[PDB]
Design a protein around this ligand. Structure first.
Ligand SMILES: O=C(O)[C@@H]1C[C@@H](O)N(c2ccc(F)cc2F)C1
Length: 218
C-alpha cells in the first residue's frame, strides 16, 4: 500500500496516544525534544480559493504552489522562474515562466495571483526558525486545515489558537508550534516515555483522527 507514509504515521500516533502521555504524573516534556528531527519543509502560508480555482500555498523555503480543482499541481521554485508541473497521473515536468509556455499560461497567471496575495496579506508561519514536496491533498474542518505533503509530512493548522502540528513519519517526529509562536520538535517515542501536557496530547488525538480521514479517502 503506497499511501505516502500515512499508515506508518497512524501507527506512530496510535502508539503514543495509547500510552496516555498526559497522565504520567511525573511529566518531563523537555526530555523528548530532538533538534535533529527539525523539519525542512512545512506550509508557511495558504489561501483557499477552492470554489473557483484551487488551494494556493507557500512553503517555508519561499516556493509557492497551487493544487488546482482539476487535481494538477503547479509549483514555482524560490528563484521566481523555475516551474514544476504535476499532471493528473503523477507525471512531472519542468519548465520556466520566462519561456512563456502557451500550455500553462492561465495556471501560471493564477499561481502568480496567489503568490502576490500571500506576500501582501499573510504572515509567514514558522518564520522565527531555519526533494521539494508538493501538496498531495488537503481538507478543512471547523477546527483546522489538514495538509498532506508528498514527502509524507502532515501539517495541521488549528484556526482557533493558531497552534500547528507538523508530523514527519520518516523521523517518527512531531513539531509543535504553540500560541506564543514557540517551536518545538519531539520524538513521538520519547513522548510515550516522558509524557506531555494535556494540550499537545489532545492535538495528537485529533491528528490520529485526521490521518484516518486521509486514509479513508484515497
Ligand atoms: O480575473 C482575474 O484577474 C483573476 C480572477 C480572480 O479570481 N483572481 C485571483 C485569484 C486568487 C487570488 F489570490 C487573487 C486573485 F486576484 C484574479
Amino acid at each position: 500500500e503506497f499511501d505516502c507514509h500515512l499508515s506508518d504515521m497512524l501507527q506512530q500516533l496510535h502508539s503514543v496516544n495509547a500510552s496516555k502521555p498526559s497522565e504520567r504524573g511525573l511529566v518531563r516534556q523537555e526530555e523528548a525534544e530532538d533538534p535533529a528531527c527539525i523539519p525542512i519543509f512545512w506550509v508557511s502560508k495558504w489561501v483557499d480559493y477552492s470554489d473557483k480555482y484551487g488551494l494556493g500555498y507557500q512553503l517555508c523555503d519561499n516556493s509557492v504552489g497551487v493544487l488546482f480543482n482539476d487535481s494538477t499541481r503547479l509549483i514555482l521554485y524560490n528563484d521566481g522562474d523555475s516551474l514544476q508541473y504535476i499532471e493528473r497521473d503523477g507525471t512531472e515536468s519542468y519548465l520556466t515562466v520566462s519561456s512563456h509556455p502557451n500550455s500553462l499560461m492561465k495556471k501560471i497567471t493564477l499561481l502568480k495571483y496567489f503568490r502576490n496575495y500571500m506576500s501582501e496579506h499573510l504572515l509567514k508561519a514558522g518564520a522565527n526558525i531555519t526533494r521539494l514536496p508538493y501538496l498531495r491533498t488537503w481538507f478543512r474542518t471547523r477546527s483546522a486545515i489538514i495538509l498532506h505533503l508528498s514527502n509524507g509530512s502532515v501539517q495541521i493548522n488549528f484556526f482557533q489558537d493558531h497552534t500547528k502540528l507538523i508530523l514527519c513519519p520518516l523521523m517518527a517526529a512531531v513539531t509543535y508550534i504553540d500560541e506564543k509562536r514557540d517551536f518545538r520538535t519531539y520524538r513521538l517515542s520519547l513522548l510515550e516515555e516522558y509524557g506531555c501536557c494535556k494540550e499537545l496530547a489532545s492535538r495528537l488525538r485529533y491528528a490520529r483522527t485526521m490521518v484516518d480521514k486521509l486514509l479513508s479517502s484515497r
